[PDB]
From a paper:
Transcription of pre-ribosomal RNA initiates by binding of RNA polymerase I (Pol I) to [name], which stabilizes its monomeric form. Subsequently, Pol I and [name] are recruited to the core promoter by the upstream activating factor (UAF), TATA-binding protein (TBP) and core factor to form the Pol I pre-initiation complex (PIC). Here, we present cryo-electron microscopy (cryo-EM) reconstructions of several Pol I ICs, including two CCs, two spontaneously formed OC intermediates and two OCs varying between 2.7 to 3.7 Å resolution. Together, the different reconstructions provide mechanistic insights into complex assembly, allow following template and non-template DNA strand paths, show the necessary conformational changes during promoter opening and reveal the interplay between [name] and [name] [name] in promoter escape.
We obtained an independent reconstruction of the Pol I-[name]-DNA complex from the OC dataset lacking the CF where the [name] [name] is observed in the same position as in the Pol I EC complex. The movement of the [name] [name] towards the stalk appears to destabilize the interaction of [name] with Pol I subunit [name] by pushing the [name] N-terminal region away from the stalk. It was previously suggested that [name] is involved in the release of [name] during the early phase of elongation. However, no mechanistic insight of how [name] could regulate the release of [name] was available. Our results thus provide structural evidence that rationalize the previous observations on the role of the [name] [name] in promoter opening and [name] dissociation. Further transition to the EC requires a slight movement of the upstream DNA that would collide with [name] [name] in the initiation position. As a result, the [name] [name] moves to its elongation position, where it displaces the N-terminal region of [name] to further destabilize [name] binding to Pol I.
Author numbering:
A (entry chain O): 48 to 248, 324 to 551, 581 to 614
B (entry chain B): 803 to 813, 819 to 917
C (entry chain D): 12 to 49, 80 to 100
D (entry chain G): 8 to 95, 99 to 174, 214 to 251
E (entry chain M): 179 to 403
F (entry chain F): 55 to 154
G (entry chain A): 344 to 406, 417 to 637
H (entry chain L): 28 to 70
Amino acid sequence: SAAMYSRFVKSALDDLDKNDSTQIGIIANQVALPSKNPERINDKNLNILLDILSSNINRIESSRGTFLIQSIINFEKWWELPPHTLSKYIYFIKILCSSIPKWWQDVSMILVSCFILPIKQTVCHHDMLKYFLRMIPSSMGFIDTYLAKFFPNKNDTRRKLVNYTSNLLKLRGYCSELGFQIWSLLIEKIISIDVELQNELGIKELSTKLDSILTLVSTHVEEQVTPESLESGEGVGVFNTLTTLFKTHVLPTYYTRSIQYIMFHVSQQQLELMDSFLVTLIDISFAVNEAAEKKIKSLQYLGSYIARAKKLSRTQIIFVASYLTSWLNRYVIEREEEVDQRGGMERFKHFYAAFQALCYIFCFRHNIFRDTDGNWECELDKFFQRMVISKFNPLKFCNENVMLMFARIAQQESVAYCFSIIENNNNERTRQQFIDLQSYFPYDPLFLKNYKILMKEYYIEWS
Amino acid sequence: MYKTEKVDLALDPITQHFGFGNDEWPKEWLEKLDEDGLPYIGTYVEEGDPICAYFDDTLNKTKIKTYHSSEPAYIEEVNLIGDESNKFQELQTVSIKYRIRRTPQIGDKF
Amino acid sequence: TATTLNTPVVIHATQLPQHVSTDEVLQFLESFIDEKENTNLSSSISQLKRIQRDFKGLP
Amino acid sequence: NENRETARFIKKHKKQVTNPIDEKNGTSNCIVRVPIALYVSLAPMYLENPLQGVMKQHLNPLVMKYNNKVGGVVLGYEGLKILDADPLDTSEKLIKITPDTPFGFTWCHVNLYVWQPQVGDVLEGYIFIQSASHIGLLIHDAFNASIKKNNIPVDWTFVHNDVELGHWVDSNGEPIDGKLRFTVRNVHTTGRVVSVDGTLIS
Amino acid sequence: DEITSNDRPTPLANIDATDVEQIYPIESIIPKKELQFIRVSSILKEADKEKKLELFPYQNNSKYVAKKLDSLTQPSQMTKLQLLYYLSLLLGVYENRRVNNKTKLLERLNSPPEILVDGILSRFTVIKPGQFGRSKDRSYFIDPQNEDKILCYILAIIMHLDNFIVEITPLAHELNLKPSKVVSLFRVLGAIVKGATVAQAEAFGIPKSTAASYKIATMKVPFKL
Amino acid sequence: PEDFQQHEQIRRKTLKEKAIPKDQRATTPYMTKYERARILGTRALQISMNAPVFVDLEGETDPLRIAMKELAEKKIPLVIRRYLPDGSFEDWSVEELIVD
Amino acid sequence: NLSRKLVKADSFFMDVLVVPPTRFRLPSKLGEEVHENSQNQLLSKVLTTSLLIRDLNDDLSKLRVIFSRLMNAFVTIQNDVNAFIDSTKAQGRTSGKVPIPGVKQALEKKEGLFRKHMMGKRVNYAARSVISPDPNIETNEIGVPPVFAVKLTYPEPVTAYNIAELRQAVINGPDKWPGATQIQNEDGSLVSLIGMSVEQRKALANQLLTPSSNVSTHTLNKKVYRHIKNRDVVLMNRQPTLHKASMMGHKVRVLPNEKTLRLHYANTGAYNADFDGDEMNMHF
Amino acid sequence: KYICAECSSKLSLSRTDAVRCKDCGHRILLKARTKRLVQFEAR
Amino acid sequence: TTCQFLTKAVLDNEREQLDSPSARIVVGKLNNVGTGSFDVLAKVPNA
Amino acid sequence: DRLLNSSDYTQASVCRECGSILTTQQSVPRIGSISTVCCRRCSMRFEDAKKGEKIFIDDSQIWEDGQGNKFVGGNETTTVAIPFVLKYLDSELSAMGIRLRYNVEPK
Amino acid sequence: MDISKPVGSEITSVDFGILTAKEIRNLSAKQITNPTVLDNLGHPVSGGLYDLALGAFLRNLCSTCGLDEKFCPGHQGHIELPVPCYNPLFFNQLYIYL
Ligand SMILES: [Zn+2]
Ligand SMILES: [Zn+2]
Ligand SMILES: [Zn+2]
């Protein structure tokens, strides 16, 4: 009957040139049933069909040829095949839609939507993709509405969603020179679980899914940024747009705390790539025509980027940030003749924060703040002494938690004297919500139990 | 002040029926309706509250007639009007009286 | 899409299409590309460096 | 009132530039420079660098596509001019702001490359990857082409695989290297990425 | 409002035959091509009504499909069983009159042949032309032309399956209509409404006391010229 | 291209012919109130669209109130046209205009 | 004449009477009875007068009183088009209280089309209210009830400038102290909050400042529509005024009290006001 | 619980009833109160 | 009399700059008889 | 903000070279076609595609209408800040017997 | 009117005209000649006074624009008179020129 089926599929293609075309549409209603039913198309009848249709294969594009292409590519759940039928069917994707941007456009609609599937079901879901990312230059046009399209929300069940978050690191690892598109969904969607998290600080579903992102993404991307690809591979191109992309989806949202852990882990592993991010924190707040609240948080990204870590060139921490200690000299020479003019005290958000952020280094690393000889680092007996009774009172408008850790170490280590001033504070002592930006510290202590696997590495306890 | 509302039905055999039939109407508005489809006497109507949840005939469903005014008031009287007719019909006209409790607030007139 | 913020409102041509040969623009596309790094600007770099090899290179 | 109206049939349908064969090397010349008066709208964020700030406004999302008025698939810009409303050259200059919104105007004219499709002209083909009801024809390895069943020759013939893309057989039976031929009959504008649709009788 | 002339939903009918069963063809309704593309060789392998109304594409709530299902169980009566799949789509468009696409409608019918579908959509629905459906399938709409166009395939089936009688109240009310809607609708093909005769009074179970209000509709001969 | 340039150099000469430079200035040289009812709010919705600011605002989260903190300080980058209503305009700027 | 157009007689004859579109003839339901547009009643008078005289050339050319079927109906063919436009002169109507208004009479009702639709428009974002006098207002404030401090909202963008006060509008919403009712996005969405909970009030305030997914709208930002403040202006004007100094703007301070509007003492000289029932508007 | 309006002739009628007062020919029917734990206003 | 003031207006077939606010706002435009009797230009740094 | 921004602002669309708002369309497109916006008055029917040889049409003027036909012409039209009442008006006065034309400033 | 939506053009002026038979060719989509507007049964008749080819009446799809009534303006139509008649507007002007 195999020779009886081969003439049943050869007598179809004739009479479309005789404008009858009888036996065409009968088969295409069979290739759309599920695999739940034995009366569909099977192994033997398809590869015989996919060669007899390929006799003179210029026979698709006519007025009747939309009903044929769809359900062949819509062979639903197409990973149920032995390795003999699997050959010519994958070849038929390589012949049907090799140049027409109309149904190959409906192929990457399938191959991206079938990346929600587990990785051992995607043995060829991305190897089909990687071949045309090195051969075809311009098939990037009609996939540019296919990345954020196939992001469902959490109304779908758990295992389809977060497995899709890992399936595109295979795909990006061979498509390296492009750089920026693949992130542009997964940069936005760190915030969406995080937005529903700090206002919850239905909540248990944020536990293991965040375990399914934090240990997942910050390990395989950590194996992307690697010392074996510093100056020979594509590693310099990684850093070029993971600063401005961090600047436009961590800085514009406030009180949203699970997102500053992207570059908090892969460049603390080394010496230079932290210091590549040490110049990143410099250029932000130090211009004129920038945003309004850019002076506070960006230099607050220097507070626990220095304190709670372990791998720092600490001979460079005083050296590179010497301009901020030279700011403290520049702030007292040129900029203390303006206070009795029109205005209050709150012109200087740069002053209660970056001075606080360097004093956020104070209570945590006191053995760094001493040398071998016996003096103080940069003469602490005058430098943090000159700023007491000036026209701002930097012991008046302060924080609660860290700015009242100023009471233990200042006396027993003989740092400062403010114990007769604390009673004198609360007599003299928009703007009502100005405290909302000056209360949160960026790199807080870690609360989770299974991402602490990665980040107890360069994180020390209180001493 | 009073606002005597009414309910007129379909401006043929009679095919509009007060009360409930046999479908399942969505509950939690037990709090205003007796099962005869007429409401209580003396409860606090708002906007977002049925008045005459009656049973249709064209789908055999229960439709619900909520409150079309602002006026958060109470509900007072229920009259039942039909036709004296020798081929007598089931009653199809209810004239329900409200009484709205008007405290003298500032901006009134003496 | 396709509004006044997405599309320029009125477009017209200045003059006749001053023509260049096919090999003429091979000297004059490099200034369109190399001024980039001193979504769409990602796909403005990789696909246009693969049409270099139409008349200049070979894969 | 018969012959007077009929003059406008051509001046809004004249082929602006037709092109003959090029160099006798298989290809043809349809890459060309056109200055155009791009009446653009501003970027109120970017009133400190409109040399870049309006370039990201209607010009980088203008690339690699076709339009209505230039009659060609635009490809690339050069020579950013911006124009003013004064007898002023000058470094700093004025922009007319809209009287309703910060999105201002400027009636600037800048100079564009464009690709154009002409009719009945030969064009290059590369064996890039071969299709089922298409022969693989990557014009400048960038955009795609199209054929039909009704415009293939007789000696053009096919063989499908036997042991383990698709074999094509010429007039005698030997495959060749990459260079292919294609002529133009029609165009199809409104896909996602544009392409042309032709015949092979030349 | 119709490619059929002048508001009557009657296609090319017949009044000029001799056979009783051949007074009106369903080829006027369902054409030759879709009528012969039914894999019908698996229906009467089973016999029980639980194993018949549970593998069809559509399952209704009422017995309005199966009100004549026991009148055909033998496979000698397969010609009207092709109409019983059409029974399964007699209501296949009107109780989903609100929605008018197809892939959402694919979850209404568990795997039917799509070639059986688009003879009703192309004529009896008024199409919304939209290419947002056309990559999938053919979207449509039902206008207010379509209220009395949707019953004549009961006046040639429910008439046809019981030797050409139709009673009012198991038809005017199982279709949820008032029995005065049909008197101005009886004469749209050539049907005749008539009272209670002397022999066929037992076909519903009525006495003679309401026989002037007991009104029947049937077909015996070709329509009176 | 043919009568495009008929509408390209008919405007570059009817802008010479309709202009008046600062030498033939004839209008009142004050920053007046309709001007003050204009260039604030013309910058104020412009500064609302994340436009750059030069002077440190005192946290005063109103788009209108920043520009009056600029108007009496003159870091206001706007230029005013003024119509003489029979086919001639006159130009100004804010650096050479002084406030009532 | 820059185009050099001939004038022709064919324009001054009515060949067509172009019929107005669907959206401009729409029959609504009003009263006990319902019937369609009174324009279509003029049109459906012409057609069956046209199509009566249209089908007479059948009765002469496909070959007496039959000639009077056209001439003494041409006086009604004349009377077709005119009463569509202008009904000053039609056949003698008895006192039936109304002849039908076609277009020009149907423009101007009590000669008020431009006077109520084109020029004198009915306006959104209003408030009509009874006035009250109250102190402690320096002649350009208006004390307002919170029920006008929750209804009339104000469009205002987010920036890297309006976050700290503006997230307070989002977290209240339409509940209380002025909040945020219709949050929009980079494309023009309408994300309401009139039923969204305080979980969705703390959520969206951590969301509002985000660059667009489409980089074709790369510069825009979301517009949090806050209600009203101590920092915006209410314009107010009296209805029968007949002078210039009546459209006097004021700012507003929220005033937790009953439901009326509070004029200041001294301001009654401009508006020619009483308090014997008189009451004036409020705009925004 | 439907008190008539003719002579307070108390009846408790259901649906599908022939409406008349039950001594003479009057139609109009009121409705009576039922105890409900409902919170009411007092200032 | 705008019924009768178009027999003297359409018949002439004029060109109106419609600059009075009884014609300026009927198309929707900023007024020449007030605080928008002109527009604003904008200084930009460089070409 | 008062007399135009009540609710009457829109981005109405005006065919230039005849000057109307009621005439243009957002046409129901072809199979792949997106944002098919054109006019009908400045266009003409493809049954009049005849004639110098016959010129090959350039596919930017083949576009499907609503009834199912195919006609050719009258392409470019932008969005103009117009009240709907004016868009009501130029069809109110077209019916009484006055033809109307508008124009714009960018040509 | 929102700041987030710009507009790239304006309106300058007005122009008048008078109805000629030449401009009836391309002004519409379908004739209107049948007298009544919709019969029984609820449908608006096609080629009718509430045609769908003249706008979109009563939540039907618009057979000119293909999308719903939230995006349909409604289109121009036209009668054809039996004889070309007067315009009583202009009866005060070309009475005398005649
Ligand atoms: Zn009694
Ligand atoms: Zn036009
Ligand atoms: Zn339409």
